[PDB]
Amino acid sequence: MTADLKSLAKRIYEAYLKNFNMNKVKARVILSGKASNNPPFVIHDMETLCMAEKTLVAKLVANGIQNKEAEVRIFHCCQCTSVETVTELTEFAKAIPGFANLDLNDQVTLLKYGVYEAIFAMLSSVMNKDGMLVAYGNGFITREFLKSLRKPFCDIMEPKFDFAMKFNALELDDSDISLFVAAIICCGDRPGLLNVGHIEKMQEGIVHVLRLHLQSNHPDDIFLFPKLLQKMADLRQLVTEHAQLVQIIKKTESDAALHPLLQEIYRDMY
Ligand SMILES: *c1ccc([N+](=O)[O-])cc1C(=O)Nc1ccccc1
Ligand SMILES: *c1ccc([N+](=O)[O-])cc1C(=O)Nc1ccccc1
Ligand SMILES: *c1ccc([N+](=O)[O-])cc1C(=O)Nc1ccccc1
Ligand SMILES: CC(C)(Oc1ccc([C@@H]2CC2(Cl)Cl)cc1)C(=O)O
């Protein structure tokens, strides 16, 4: 249990709560509705989509996407939410003791492979069996409407709902997700890592606080730590399959222009 570790556990917790505006507590209260009778605007078909797109009429006109196919509009603003999460993650990583001290090539490498493995883990916080919160909790896209899209777009988010359902069953709080996300970033297994030895030292410190933190917060889930280690493996597989589907859609779809920042991350990944 010790004391210095508890401080580190909360440095990682105070960060995250500061960099990620949408956490599990806020999301879990919206989906519960036990704090407001003003539910979010549900998006379950093309009509509700075009309605919700009436608000964001400026972002679409200036971006030249107003008259694009429905699938290209969704996975284009949704692509904009990941560019924001990558920025927040880059700042959250600074709170990880030892990360700012590593070589820039290693920092860029760790974030290059860990951003999406964490985007999908945190994405589960705003997901249930029927949909996921969007627009900072103001909207709610249905899990079925995303499947109703034409392939391959309909095969993009369904795997995320699959992981989220099994992941959310572990019943973690932001205190646990923070350390978990920190462990994802500190992974000495990423390809091309220079000082592969030091990063392993930094990962052991985080993974150790995570094991002790889970043992202290979820005392009855003896094997919660092994379960999370398995989830880290599934996230790596989930990102691999996802990144492969972006390259496929990047050439076979002449109307879906990938974002520049995300274009560098997906380059020569898996
Ligand atoms: C993304 C796609 C479509 C819309 N829309 O039809 O309004 C909105 C968004 C979105 O993420 N908006 C947003 C902006 C700023 C902060 C939170 C959410
Ligand atoms: C980001 C947020 C919202 C929208 N939108 O719905 O108009 C678009 C974006 C965005 O980043 N679009 C984009 C795509 C490709 C290259 C640059 C910018
Ligand atoms: C896509 C990925 C992540 C989020 N998010 O968690 O804020 C949202 C979206 C998204 O596509 N939102 C959306 C779609 C359509 C209309 C409004 C908002
Ligand atoms: C997690 C998420 C939403 O996955 C995507 C989805 C769509 C795209 C864009 C449209 C093509 Cl396929 Cl060029 C890139 C990444 C993201 O990275 O923002």
From Swiss-Prot:
The chain holds residues 200 to 468 of 468 of the full protein. Residues 41-268 form the NR LBD domain. It comes from Homo sapiens. The keyword Transcription applies. Its main location: nucleus. GO terms for cellular component: chromatin; nucleoplasm; nucleus. Indeglitazar binds at residues 82, 116, 266. GO terms for biological process: behavioral response to nicotine; cell differentiation; cellular response to fructose stimulus; cellular response to starvation; circadian regulation of gene expression; enamel mineralization; epidermis development; fatty acid metabolic process. Skeletal muscle, liver, heart and kidney. Expressed in monocytes. Ubiquitinated by E3 ubiquitin-protein ligase HUWE1; leading to proteasomal degradation. It is found in: Nucleus. The gene is PPARA. Induction: Down-regulated by aging. This is Peroxisome proliferator-activated receptor alpha. One of its GO terms (molecular function) is RNA polymerase II-specific DNA-binding transcription factor binding. Keywords: Activator, Biological rhythms, DNA-binding, Lipid-binding, Metal-binding, Nucleus, Receptor, Transcription, Transcription regulation, Ubl conjugation, Zinc, Zinc-finger. Ligand-activated transcription factor. Key regulator of lipid metabolism. Activated by the endogenous ligand 1-palmitoyl-2-oleoyl-sn-glycerol-3-phosphocholine (16:0/18:1-GPC). Activated by oleylethanolamide, a naturally occurring lipid that regulates satiety. Receptor for peroxisome proliferators such as hypolipidemic drugs and fatty acids. Regulates the peroxisomal beta-oxidation pathway of fatty acids. Functions as a transcription activator for the ACOX1 and P450 genes. Transactivation activity requires heterodimerization with RXRA and is antagonized by NR2C2. Residues 106-235 are annotated as: Required for heterodimerization with RXRA. The keyword NAD does not apply.
